Structures are given as structure tokens and as C-alpha cells.
Amino acid sequence: LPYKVADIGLAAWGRKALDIAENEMPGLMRMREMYSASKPLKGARIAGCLHMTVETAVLIETLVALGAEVRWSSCNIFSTQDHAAAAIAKAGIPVFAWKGETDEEYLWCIEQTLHFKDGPLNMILDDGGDLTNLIHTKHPQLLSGIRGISEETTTGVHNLYKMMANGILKVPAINVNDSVTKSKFDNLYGCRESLIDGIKRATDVMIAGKVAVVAGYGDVGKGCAQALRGFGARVIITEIDPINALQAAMEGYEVTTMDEACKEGNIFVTTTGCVDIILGRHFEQMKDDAIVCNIGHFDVEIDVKWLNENAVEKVNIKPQVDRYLLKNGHRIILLAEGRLVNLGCAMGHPSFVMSNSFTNQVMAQIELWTHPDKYPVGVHFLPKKLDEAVAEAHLGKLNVKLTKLTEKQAQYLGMPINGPFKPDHYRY
Amino acid sequence: LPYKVADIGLAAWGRKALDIAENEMPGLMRMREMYSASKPLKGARIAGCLHMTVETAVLIETLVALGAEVRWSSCNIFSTQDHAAAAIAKAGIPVFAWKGETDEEYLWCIEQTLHFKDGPLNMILDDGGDLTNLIHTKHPQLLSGIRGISEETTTGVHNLYKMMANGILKVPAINVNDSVTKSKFDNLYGCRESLIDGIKRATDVMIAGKVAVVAGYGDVGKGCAQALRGFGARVIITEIDPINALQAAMEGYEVTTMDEACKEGNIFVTTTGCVDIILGRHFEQMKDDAIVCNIGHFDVEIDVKWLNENAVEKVNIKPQVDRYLLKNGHRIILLAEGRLVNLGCAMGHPSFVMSNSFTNQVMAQIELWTHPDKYPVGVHFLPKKLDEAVAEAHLGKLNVKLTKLTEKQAQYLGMPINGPFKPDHYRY
Amino acid sequence: LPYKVADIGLAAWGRKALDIAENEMPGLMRMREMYSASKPLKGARIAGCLHMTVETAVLIETLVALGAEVRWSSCNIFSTQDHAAAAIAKAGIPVFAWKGETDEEYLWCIEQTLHFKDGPLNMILDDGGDLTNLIHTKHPQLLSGIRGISEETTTGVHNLYKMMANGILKVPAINVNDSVTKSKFDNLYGCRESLIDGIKRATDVMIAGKVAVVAGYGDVGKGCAQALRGFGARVIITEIDPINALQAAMEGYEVTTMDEACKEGNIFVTTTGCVDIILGRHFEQMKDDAIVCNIGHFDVEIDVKWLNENAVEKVNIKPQVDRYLLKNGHRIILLAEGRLVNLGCAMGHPSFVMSNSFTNQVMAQIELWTHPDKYPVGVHFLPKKLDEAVAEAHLGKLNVKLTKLTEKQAQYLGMPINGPFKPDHYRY
Amino acid sequence: LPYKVADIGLAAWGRKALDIAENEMPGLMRMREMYSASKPLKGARIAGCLHMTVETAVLIETLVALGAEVRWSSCNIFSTQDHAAAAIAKAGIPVFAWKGETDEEYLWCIEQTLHFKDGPLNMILDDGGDLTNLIHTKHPQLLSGIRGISEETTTGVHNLYKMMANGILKVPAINVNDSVTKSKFDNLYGCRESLIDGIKRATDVMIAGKVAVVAGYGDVGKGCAQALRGFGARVIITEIDPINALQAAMEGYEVTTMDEACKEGNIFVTTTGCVDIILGRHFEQMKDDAIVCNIGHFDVEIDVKWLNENAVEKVNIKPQVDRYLLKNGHRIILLAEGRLVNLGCAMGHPSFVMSNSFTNQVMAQIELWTHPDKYPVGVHFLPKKLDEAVAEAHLGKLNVKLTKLTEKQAQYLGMPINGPFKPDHYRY
Numbered sequence A, B, C, D: 001l002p003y004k005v006a007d008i009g010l011a012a013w014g015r016k017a018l019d020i021a022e023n024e025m026p027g028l029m030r031m032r033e034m035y036s037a038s039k040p041l042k043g044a045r046i047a048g049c050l051h052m053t054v055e056t057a058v059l060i061e062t063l064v065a066l067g068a069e070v071r072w073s074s075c076n077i078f079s080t081q082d083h084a085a086a087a088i089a090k091a092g093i094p095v096f097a098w099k100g101e102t103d104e105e106y107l108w109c110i111e112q113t114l115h116f117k118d119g120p121l122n123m124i125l126d127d128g129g130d131l132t133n134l135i136h137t138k139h140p141q142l143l144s145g146i147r148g149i150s151e152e153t154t155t156g157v158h159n160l161y162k163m164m165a166n167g168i169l170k171v172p173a174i175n176v177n178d179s180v181t182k183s184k185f186d187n188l189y190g191c192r193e194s195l196i197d198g199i200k201r202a203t204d205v206m207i208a209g210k211v212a213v214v215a216g217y218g219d220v221g222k223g224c225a226q227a228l229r230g231f232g233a234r235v236i237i238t239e240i241d242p243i244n245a246l247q248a249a250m251e252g253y254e255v256t257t258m259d260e261a262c263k264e265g266n267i268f269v270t271t272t273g274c275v276d277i278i279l280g281r282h283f284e285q286m287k288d289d290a291i292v293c294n295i296g297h298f299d300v301e302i303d304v305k306w307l308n309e310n311a312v313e314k315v316n317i318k319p320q321v322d323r324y325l326l327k328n329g330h331r332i333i334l335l336a337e338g339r340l341v342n343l344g345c346a347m348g349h350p351s352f353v354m355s356n357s358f359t360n361q362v363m364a365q366i367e368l369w370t371h372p373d374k375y376p377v378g379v380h381f382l383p384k385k386l387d388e389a390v391a392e393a394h395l396g397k398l399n400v401k402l403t404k405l406t407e408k409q410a411q412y413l414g415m416p417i418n419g420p421f422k423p424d425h426y427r428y
Ligand SMILES: NC(=O)c1ccc[n+]([C@@H]2O[C@H](COP(=O)([O-])OP(=O)(O)OC[C@H]3O[C@@H](n4cnc5c(N)ncnc54)[C@H](O)[C@@H]3O)[C@@H](O)[C@H]2O)c1
Pocket: A154, A186, A187, A190, A191, A215, A216, A217, A218, A219, A220, A221, A238, A239, A240, A241, A244, A271, A272, A273, A274, A277, A295, A296, A297, A298, A340, A341, A342, A343, D403, D405, D409, D421
């Protein structure tokens, strides 16, 4: 089997997307711009596990353009875009992913990306940990062949840190999830753009003059609050951390407990990443037709079960849009059944945010692979200079003119003209 | 013929919409709250010409709930929503409108709303002027029967002022288009919400870090500029009026000529309402894949013909999304073929903005009809106290607590406790 | 007597100020740029009554540079800046104004500006109405000699409208107070800049994280709210007008009654222009050390008498800064004794706002005087094209590049290439 | 000698200040609220070297209220406020500081805080390093007596890291300068408030409609850019770091080089902290009367010498306000002679920012002293839980209602209900 796609007749339609997305993903394109000749990953056989979408497709072809051997599989049974997957398979790349697979076909798709024409994979590019996990639990033999790993998710990195603590980790990893260019875009800037896209696409509701309660003031809460605020809404924040809470207050946001906020909000967004954010006692207080959605942790922040078990009626207005009737006589509009609203009611993050996240993947791959004896078994952070690098790949499209430190100023600041410009503890 | 709808089997699905929109249209609901008993329009036979949509539907039932006899027809061959029209016809109301009619069936639908069981229409509720025009040019006999007119559009009002200047106007009108609650919502607040809805639905493009050039700084340009600015874009304004231009400068926006701005922008929005805004000489300078859309005057602001006649390729990416290839090698993404992007790539204005516009209609109808000898033939402005009134109908849903002037303060300010609080020349 | 200044030895120090202010007052400078040669006011003998300050000084010399004969007096016993008045007197111009005059010397100063070497004044440039009043009540003989009046204040214009209603008005006036370039700057933009200057200069208090209650959402409330909001404060608005209240809600501001807001705010600003805004019942609820100031109507919005009559202690922290101790144990910091905080705790409005207000004066003077039989006795509004004109005098320093309508677009828009670009009813 | 103050007759006036500042410094007040009874610092003899001001005064009395023995001296010859210093000395506390001391009396003032009635100091609270340095270079004998150090400045901490690298450091330190509550307030929030206070107090210039060029987008540049933006200016950023540069672009700011920006700006702010930011080649291009000031590193960012050596004229407009005339005919307004504008043209940071910085000091002192064998010789970071703690001391005055994690959620999140809520690598 060369690959397994739903319909390869879709390839021609996928390429169209790829060539449009490319213009919005400068990181990946500049990667090809400076390395496609040097082929830094020449020799590597990257087994990738990442949702197969137009953006991910652009990444793969970049990995390939840098001289790498690549085998791909999605990291979610549905997340994969078929015309994008088809174009890859059709590109002569082995991809095993179709939208809506079985937990059984999924594990198989992955198993396929482990062995190449010249042998087994020597590098991992994971989003979620499944790839890295499957190898460790079932293919420990191959382990000694993989030069390094690449993780871009909290979950993925958490388990990575866990395995390591258990001496389980045998191949060194690079945590690209905590890069500022990755995090800021994945969390802050991304949700800032798509949050309202979801709410509007599901309700077409006016945001101005409304009270929006955003639970949590982390990067996502920050982007969501900012987003809503720009539309004319009165954002109220809830938090458990004193520092994030203070950050919000300092910005003009009222900070209360959900127990109080629930009686005031017209729109509710959870950014927590923790359980029991919006409960039944809150729903009973919410104004009529309050919109409740979640953009943090998949479906565990809102108590949907309660809505299902206590509402007098429930009518699906449209896909990912339900409107419950409470015994108190008030209606509650729920979005995406409590799952991520930006992905469930919108198209998720814009390509540009993807460009930063993925370029980090390329950055990691190029480094691990290129520096064989540099990283001991363990989950490391992406060297700052590399993080700074993915940032610079986007300046330009943004049409930003970066100034260069003179030898004099560099010496004054006691730092390299190109070398990292900030300490590791620096929080931008 | 009782009515003419595409499919009355749609009624049940329309009602659902109506009952959802109602919650977002307080003006109309409060109208019923205080007048449905007094039936202020009791005796009137309103012939209405307004796109038949869920929002317009809610309005009609409010006119009816106030004791009026109503006959309806859309004011655009396509604008009419059928499940919303069906529910009206099914409600026992005579509506003549289906999406996609012929210029012939359109004139007929209108002709139908002129005669009631008890005689001909005695009142007009028009959006566009067609109704008022058709009567004047073809049914002058009825003219002496209509107590008054209601116009809510510039076009509609312009022609009204014109007819009057020609002594053609025989029935007094009330220009509700220039009410601040009507205008601010229809122009400022509405486009502020939907502009980005359009661009995102068509391109799913990241707005932050992009240069947006908004041509014109009127109410629409103001809303569009504010909207984009909140997303992280660098808005550059163009203008012909020194006062609007100054207004923009005072707010931090750079103001230049399109001739220069064209070489800098990534997104282009026209708010002008005038011709020749974006020409071929501009396209030839725009960056690769610049997005160009219009939200002002229907399709006359951008030079689409040129794109059609000078591009090397043209490919429809999706409905209302075309991507031209210029001889210079750059691509230009055009939205809604130069027509309104919020209506052509999104769902138009939210119900709340509709609630303000329509409540003005109800306000006008109630006044003209209720004051037989108050208004001489001529296009008048909606009394300020009525404009203030539609505003108050929305405070509350907005959860705004308006304070009341004491008799002392009222005497001090030399104004009524409820009477108008500002002079006519006041610009909020 | 040639003039009456406190100390003419101050002249050299005044000129320094004048030459610095000039750079920030383009309107007056462009006036001289295009009219100092044509001398449009050649022949006029302007009797002016306007606080004698550096800005006003720049204006006078502009009136003079345009070929006019000018005699000046301040319109407030203290508002006059002496080094600015001295430089004028020293410039060979007759000015009768010193800071801190007696209600007796004030009336005399004014009486002096009525007669010139070539006869009595034939034009009035008033700010307050005193000049125009004094002539009407005591010098009716001169009345027939004055070609026109210029008023730039509400008070002034109110009385102007009153006199007219009583057939008292004998010389036509031009209400420049309602120009958008005058109003927006005097009210909106000015207070936006100076409000915080006052609070900071009096308290040096951090604004971020604080709740600021702004009473009134008119032009001043708008600027004050915007100002505070930008500093990170949570602004709560109070209003009696539904339209202004809605405008605030649509912008994300909570709107309540002072009765409730008083228990929440940390800073209080009155923008009302009406009495009994902050009363004793409010003070008793205010948080400890709440800052209360007024920027609307001079000292009638806050109930200071109550503070004086009910506080347990009162200690003057510094000029224009008092801190009362209430029986409840809470302290209340009052600013400028309830009088205007921006003038009383800061330097008032920046020169640029003055430039717009004054250029209006020049604009009015040039028009009335130049068009002898154009204006019938009555208070008229400044022609829009003139209002637009003062706006354009500032574009440039702002470095704004206004685009010019082509003959084609002008015809399309049905408006002049330079002629007014908007209808009188237009509210920018 | 018990202490050395300029004038102890000033004490009574100092106390007034102290009791006003206290209300704006909750951190210090809550410190006393919970520890004044337990006297956590009971036994310590703190030798402090910190500018003696009203704020610092409040801190000292807090250290004393916690059961500590304290001896104080300023860390700048002028920074010390005398009425604040007098009230401390008068309070029975030994303070050696007066505004305007000699580099000789300064070293002596410090020497005084080294020995107590019960022996030498056993703890250091330093701002700058002088204290810690003086002991190391001249009093190594005492070294073994000090349980720990507290540094809150970059300079101070830099040297600390340096000494340590040279094995010189003998007593462990705690870098409180890098706490987020310290840094965010000292750098971001503080300068955001005072920047404009400076410019306005020196020039009283309108900010709106002006182009402000902020060099550097670090914490200060962020606050300064945000500040100016809120006033209506068009902020242009310059940067050497790609990440900060991208951060700015993503927020709507144009990013260029000073070499280009210089030809556009009206106001110039340096936030760099590096040399040669604004040079003569820039001045020669700046618009007429451009305002140039520095708020970053004391006087090394702007090339003042050049202005001095190349201007045709130089006239001091007022203290800390000079206006040079260049050979090109343009004038350049310089603020605070290139030194910090917020301190030199304004009153510096508001008390609240001081409250966060100082509470960090108290936090450090309480920890080091209370945990004798917890910290090995070396510069450590303030435990996150302590940083979170100083944050919570201010929630409340801000009237923020922090929610508490349930045992369930805490277990889910795998974190303590009160324990730190974020990893060390977390950048808020
Ligand atoms: N839908 C998306 O596109 C998308 C993209 C990135 C991240 N996320 C998810 O969003 C969540 C937030 O991530 P950040 O945004 O990266 O996380 P974060 O750790 O920076 O912030 C989460 C915040 O929630 C606060 N919080 C925790 N429990 C709370 C509670 N009970 N009530 C109120 N506040 C509480 C925390 O103090 C913290 O500040 C995570 O689950 C993350 O995986 C979603």
C-alpha cells in the first residue's frame, strides 16, 4: 500500500487550496527558501502524526523540500481534510488519513508511517503523542533508530514529561508547544480571530452592547476577551490565579466569580481547560437566550449533561447549535455541544497561526536531526534563537522592517547581533 | 388571491425563526407591549414594500398587533426569505413575495398590496420608494386616500425630496432614514459587526498584522475602520471631506489617497457610495493576493469590469469569491463581485440593528396615522422624541438603567422630564 | 489710555509663548497664509471679548494680519494670561485685561474696546455674550454700526437666541459654537486630553484597575470615558438620554444610575451640565478616598456645600485638592472645589483645540464683514463650507492627504468638487 | 548619631503623605494585616538602601511592623523625599538620607545602616547593589552574618549574577526584579501611566493626530505604545528582536527602522536601554518642533551631546524642557535632557506600582530570613507562590473576586488549591 486516502480524485482540488494557503504561511515558505537547496533534513525519514489539512499539507511538502523522507497520518479521525490529503498522496507522498476513521483504521494508518523503503523511521513529528507512544509501547525495537521527537501540544508534552519521569522516554524530544511564536499564535492570536467567527456563524448575533463572561484569563481568555471587547461588549472575567486576575483588572475588565457573573452575562465563553466551569446552578440564573460556548478544553468545561437531563425541551437550531428550554422558562443557546466553538462552528485558526506552529515543527526537526549528539534523552525547549527565527520568517509578509544591532550596541547590550536577544526567563 | 408565496409548507419553519429573532428585536416587542392593547394603528391599512425576511416578518406582526390592516410585498426580487414569508401568509396576512422573482412578477406583487377588503390602502410603509412611486405614477386616484408615507432609505428619501421639489408629492412623508437610531445602526453598528463576517466567511483570512485601506470615513467607514482595528490591522483611511478626514486623524488613522494606499494595503474596503474608488491603476499596484471588497454602494465603487477585461486568468474559488491573475503576476481576490460583502458573503446586519430601523417605521406609522392634520405634504424628519423613544425600547435588553431628570434639574436644564433632551441640530 | 495691562515688562516673555503656540495652531496661521495679503477684514474694527491667553493672542494677531482694527478685553476676570496680554499691548494693540480684576474694572475694560481712532466698533467677536449684551443694554446707539456678531459659547448663543426671540437682537450673529470643528474639539477632543491631566496633576493616582463613573455621555462624557478607558479603568456611565445611553452601551460601557454607580466607583467625573449630579446620599456610599471631580458645568454638578456642611474634617492637600472625612469614616478627595478640573488642576485644552475654535471666529468675522447684506438679524450657523474650511487648515500639520473628487465623481455624487460635501442634517 | 535628615521639622508633613499613600499601597498594608502579629521578620536587622520616598517610607514601616530591626539609607543622592525621610527618623527609625547629597556623604549614610544596637545587620534589602557591594568589598567580616539579600533592579541583579560567577557572592540573594508583579508594574503599567504625564507636564501638547515613534517594544515600549495609542496618536515601532517586533505588528503597529521613522514622527520615545538610538542624522530629518524624550536607560539612548554641539541656538523653555534650533531651520524640543522623562518631567510611577515592587521586597525578606537553610549562596527567583501572593494582596482594592479551585478541579488540573497555578516557564 502506497497510501490510503478517501478519494484521490480530489487531489487537483486540494492543490488549489495548498497554493492559496502557501501565501499565508511564510514560515514554511521561507524554510524552503533557504533550506530547500541545502536539504538540512536530507537523510531523515520523518513519520508524522498531525491532522491532515491544507496547512499540514503545506508543512509536509516543506519537510520534503528540505530533503527529508516523509510518511504521514492524521492525529484525529476527523480533523483530516481529504482534498488536502489526496493531493499529498497524489504528490507521491504516503499519507494514511481520511475524515471519519475508526479507532481501528486510525491505529493502522499510524503503523504504516513507521517503515520506509530504506528502513524504519529515524525521526518523529508528533502532535498529541500517539506516534511517540505507539513506538514506545509496541515498537521499542525501532526506538534506538529515532534521532529525536517533536511535540507541539500540551497533552503531548505532558505525557512526554511523564514518560521521562518514569525513565520510559528513550528518544530525546523538543517541546515546541511552549515556544512563544507557537503558543502566542495557537492560543492568543488564533482564538482572538476565530472565537467570534464561531459565535457569529452559529447565531449571527450582534455582539455590541452585550455582556460577555470569559472564564479564565490565560492566553486564550486574553485573546477572547480582547476580541469581544473590540466588538463593543462588556467583558467580565473570572479567574483562580491572582496574577492573571490582576492582569485583567489592570486592563479595565471586571473580575468576579462565575457564581455572580452567571446572572449578568449574555454570552459565556470558557477558556479554563479545567472542569466544572459552567454548572446547572449557573444555567438557572442565566438571562433568557444566553449563548454558552467553550473554546478551551474539549467539552469538559460546561455541564452539558445537566442541560440534557434538566431542560424541558431541546431543539437543534442547526448543526452545532442547540437551544434548550429550562423549567424556569428561559432558553439557553449552546454551541458545538460544549466542544471547541472555533473548530466546531467555524473553520478554526487562520493559516498564518498555523504557519508559526508548523515552522516550529520544521525548526525542531532540522535541529534535532542536524545535531545528533546535542540533545540527551529528555523533553527540551526549542532554542530561543530558533524561536526568534520562526518569528523573523513572518516579518516581511507582515512587512515589518527589523533593525540590526550595530557591533557597538551589541557589545553594549552584551549580546550577539543575531544571537538570542533575551534571557530564557524573559516573558514577552 | 390571498397571497403569493413560494412554498407555504415552509411556514412552520419560519415561525421558529420569528420566535428566535423576536428576542433580539426589543423595539418591535416593546411596541406590542405598550400599544397592542390601544391599537394605535387601528383603522389603518398599511401597504408595505420591504424585503420579506424574518426581521421584516417580526415588524409586520407588530404593525398588525397594533390594530392595523396590512398587505405586504418585498422591495427586492431576491431579498425575501421564504419560510419567513410563508409564515406570514400562513399567519393570515397577504404577502406577495418569493426569492428570485421577475421584474414582472415583482410589480404585480406590489400592485396586490394596494386594495383591502374595506377599500384601498390609506398608509404607506416603503423602503426604496417603489410603493410610493407606483401609486404616484399609476394610481394617483388612491393618492388622496393615503394619510402618510414612511421611507427608511437614502434612495427612497432622495426621490421623495425630488418629487416634492417637483410638486409631485401629494402625500406627506416621514424620513426615518435620518433618525440617529436608524442611521447609527444601519450604517455604523451594523457594518461594524458584519464587515469582518463577510471577509472571514469568504477567505477565512487572519486580519491581524494586515494593512486595511478603508475608502471613506462616514458612518460605514467608521464602523469598518473600528471593526478592522479591533482585530489587529493597521487601518489607512482615504477621504474627500476634510471634517471626516480630520475625525480619522484624531483617532490615530493615517489618511492618504487611494493612489498611494493601493501600494500598501492587504485588504481594501469601499465605504464611499461614489464611483471610481478602486481602478485598474490601483490593482496593478496592489500586493499579491490583496482582498478587495465593497460594502458601500452596490457594485459601483470598484472597477470590476477592468479586472474582468484585463486579468490573465479568473477562477471562482467559491460563491462570491473570485481570484484574478494580473499580467504583473499578482493575484487579486475579489469578494461578492464588487457588490455588498456583508450581504453577499455573510448574513447582513444582526437582528438588533433591524429592530432599531423597523421600530422607526412603526414609530412613523403610529404618528402619521394618529395625527391626521399634523403633517403638510412634504418629507419630514421623525420627531426627536420618537427617535429617543425607539432608543429607549432597546435599553433594558442592553440592561441599561436610564436615570430620570428631577423636576428641579429639568427646570434648570430648561427641558421636559421626558420631552426631547437635545436640539434638532445636535449630532450625537 | 492705549491699553491696560498688569505688567508690560512681561511682553518679551509673552512673545516667546506666542511663537511656540503658533506652531500648534495651524488654523490661525493658514488664515494669515492666505488672507494676510488680501486683508479680508480690511476696514473692520473688531471689539473682542475673549480670555486673554497665549492662544487668544495668536488669534488677535491673525485678525490684525488680515487687515482688521482690533480692540480687546478678556471675558473672565482671571482667565487672562499677562505675558500674553502684555505682548499684545506691546505689539501696539489696545488690550484691557489683567488676571484677577474686579467686576468693576472688568466692565471698564470692555467699555474701552468700543471706540476706535476712526470711530466706534463695527464688528463683534464675543465669547460669553457680555460684549454683545453691554452694547445692546447700554450702547444701542452703536448697534446700527456693527455689521455682525460672533459667538462661540453655549451660554453666549443661548442668550443670543433669547434676545432674538424678544426682538432685542439688532445685529445678526453667527453661532460658531455649534460648528463640528469647534464643538468636537472644545468638547470631545479637548476634555479627552486634559481630563486625566487634571486628575494626575492633583493626585498622581494610578488610573488602571479603577472604576470610573462618568455622569453623562455627551461629547465631553464621550471624551472622558474614552480617555479613562485607555488607561485601563472600568468606566460606568450614567445618562438621562436614551440615545446617548445606547451609544455608550454599544461601545461596551455599563450604564446605570448614579444611585447605584456611587457604591462602585473610585473616580467620579461629571459631564452633565445640569444640577444635582452627585449628592450627599452618594458621598455616604462612595468607597474610601474616592476622587470626585467635575468637568462639565462650572461647580453646579457636585454638591460641595454638603461635603462642607457634613464632613467631620476637611484638609486642603494642595491647591485645588481637598480631602474630606465623613462621619462614616471614609475620605472623599474633591478636585478644584467642584469647578472645572482640567482648567483648575491642569492647563485646560491644548493649543490645537484652541486653533479650531478660534479659526472659526476668524472664519465668522471674515464672512459677516465681507458679506454686508447676506445675513438678516438673527443667530445663524457657520456655513458648512466654512466649517469644512477650518478643518482643512489643520490637515497637513496632521499630515493628512485629502483626496480630490474628480469632475466625474463630483457629478455622480451631485456635489461640488470643493463645495460642501454633506447636508446640514449630517452628524459626523 | 541616631539618623541624619535634612530637616526633622518636616516629619509632620511627611506623615500626612504616608497616610495617603498607604491607601494606594495595599500590598504593604495587607502584609501588616497578616504578619504584624506573627512578626515573621522578628529578629532580623534589615539594612536597606532604597531611595527614601513616601512609598519607600510605607515599606519600611511595614518591615518594622513585621517585627524587624531596620536601618535605612537612600540608593540615590537626590531621589530621597525629605518630609518622608524625616517622618521615618522621627518615627524612631534610623535613616540617613537627604535630597542632594555628596558622593561622600552618600557612602557614609550607607555605612551607618550596617550596625545595630544588638550587633551588625543580618539581612540586606538592596535596590542597585551598592549595599551588597559595599559589604562585599569593604566589610567581608559581616558577610557571614547576613542571612540573605533582596535585589529589585536589573543593574543590581546583573552585578549579583556577575559576582556569583566570580565566586564573590557569599550571601544568597533573591531576584525580585524578575517577578511578574514587580516587572509588569515597574516596566509595563508604570510607564504606561507616567509617560504621557511627563510629555504633557513639559509641553502641554495635544497627543491625538500625532505620529509617535517608540523605539523598542519591550515591557516599557509596550506600555508607552499602548499609552500613546489611547490618546489618538499613530504609534510606529522600531525593534531589533523579531519576536517583540512581531508582537507589535500583530497589534496593529507599523514597525520600521529609526532611520525611516525619524522623518515621520512628531514625538519620539526611547525604551531601548541601549545606546545610539536617536542620533544626529535623525535630528536633521525630524519635523519641526518634534518632541524627543527617553524613558528607558538614563540618558544614553539619545545623542544629546550632538544637539548641544550642532544646534545654532538652545533655549531652556522651563526646567527639563530645552528647545534647540538646527542649522536646517527646524526646532527640536528635548525633554529632561535625555534622562527619564517620567521621573524628570513628572512624578514617576504611581504608588500602586510601588506597592507591587515593594511587597516583593517584604516577600523576599520574610522568606530568606524565615528559611535559614533553604537557599544556597546564589541569586534565586522569588518562589512563584510568593509572586502570586503579592498579586492577591492587591486584588480587593481593585475589587477583584478571585474564584477558588474545588478539590475536584484542583485534582483534575493536578495542582494545589492555593499552591502555584502555573509552571515557572509560564509567561503571563
Ligand atoms: N479551541 C482552540 O482553538 C484552542 C487553542 C489553544 C489552546 N486551547 C485550550 O484552551 C485552554 C486555555 O489555554 P491557555 O489559553 O493556553 O491556558 P492557560 O493555562 O494560559 O490559562 C488558563 C487559565 O484558566 C484559569 N483557570 C483555571 N481554572 C479556572 C477556573 N475554574 N475558573 C476560572 N479560571 C480558571 C487559569 O488560572 C489560567 O489563567 C487549554 O485547555 C488549551 O488547551 C484551545
